[model samples]
Target: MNATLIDCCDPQKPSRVLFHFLILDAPSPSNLPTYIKELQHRGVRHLVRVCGPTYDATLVKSRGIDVHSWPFDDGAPPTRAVLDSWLKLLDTELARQQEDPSVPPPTIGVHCVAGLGRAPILVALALVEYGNVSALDAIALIREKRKGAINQTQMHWITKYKR
Candidate 1:
């Protein structure tokens, strides 16, 4: 799948904004437009890159989107600082959503080379921490939806991660 959305935000619930998380495989130049169209259609406003150098963050940014680079080693969990910063970014975004009810919620795009390892881990974390979903359920949901997302080591990291 080019991108798999793990929608954690309930459309009827104004309070939940952090979980409109989309786990995506790295897009190529040819398919980036396709990805962008889908993202716009789905209301994605912010993107978090889980790998080094994108298929170009500029392409997504040029589509009038905000991009954050949060790369880490493939198949491994992020460092503590990186994880903390990612959570803070999520917190701030959620806070912004809570501050204004009229603002339409934005789907958050999370991607890596494959969208399986690093990308889904952060998505799972957000589901657990901000969305109050259990870690196991979150992992299962991503694995089921994204199809083969979240490796064994990544699963352990998510399970051990404190809310």
Candidate 2:
């Protein structure tokens, strides 16, 4: 599977985030072993799998990358339970990374079947939370980042948002 790795940087500073990569398609152990190894070597601490089911868990585990699974398949709205799990995991990850002087808060890659759906919503949510933008505004920002993001059902939910 082919994947694109985009680097998000601090706008005002020279500091760069850790190896931040997004997989557009499911990456199997046999297919991209070299890329995974490079990521592992570059101090990438976590892999947030956005509803990908075709991965080889054993291969990922062997690379010392911790995996947190919050499956929100594309074309579907995430259930409250799943979203809560995301919040909890992200909160904990933010805290843990903050405490570790050597490790930074993970630079996440939200990916589904096409890497253009639900993952954008979650990443946009993180951008809102961490970037200090309003939630609804984040949806708009995500739309700009990935066209066709925030599926119709999700847009309905987002439109109903109130202060």
Candidate 3:
């Protein structure tokens, strides 16, 4: 499974703030080693769980990967309130990074079951709202990195997203 590397920070220092989307459950011991190593290498300070609680966060958390669970369904867009809460959380992270540039910015690993539909939508929202990119541009960026990251229906929802 290929992990998408998104430039979610200043273009000059690209990859400082990254969004690594994977298509696997959290506690798959077989995959944890590689995933954990890569995240550690990338200085990942946060692991965002987009899937429901069925996917255990302890494995990553136990290994010191800060886990943030904002569970939601995979096939549909998150409700407006949920999305707003997510954005607020992300905004706080972004602010913290901006406030302290001396410390490495946190690389966030976001995932759902396949890491395509749900994760990409959430990434797109962060890109659009925080990365200063347009919805179309965010979709293109994600698709370029992770093929078929979003579907037509998801695109429609993103385009019409308000606030």
Candidate models: Cα lDDT each: 0.79, 0.59, 0.72
Give per-residue lDDT, candidate 1, residue 135: 88
Better of 1 and 3 by lDDT: 1
In the range 15-78, model 3's lDDT, one tens digit per residue, is 4453333333354557767777777776677777777765556777888888888777667887
Q: Write the per-residue lDDT of candidate 2 for residues 1-163, one digit (tens) a residue.
A: 2444444333344265422435345565576587577556555566666685776656776878776677865676666766677667667765775588777536554456666666666565554444455667767766565566677777665455332
Tell me the TM-score of each prediction against the true structure: 0.86, 0.70, 0.80
Q: What is the C-alpha RMSD of each candidate to the true structure, in Å?
A: 2.7, 4.2, 3.2
Candidate topping lDDT: 1
- Candidate 3 clashes between residue pairs 3 or more apart in a chain or in different chains: none
lDDT of 1 at 88: 86
Give the per-residue lDDT of model 1 (tens digit) for 67-119: 88877998898879779988888788778877998766567888778777898
Better of 1 and 2 by TM-score: 1
Q: Cα miss at 60, model 1 (Å)?
A: 2.2
Q: Which candidate is the best by TM-score?
A: 1
Please report, as a residue range, the 10-residue window in candidate 2 with the lowest summed lDDT.
5-14
Q: Candidate 3: minimum summed lDDT over ten consecutive residues — where?
A: 18-27
Comparing 1 with 2 on lDDT, the higher-scoring candidate is 1
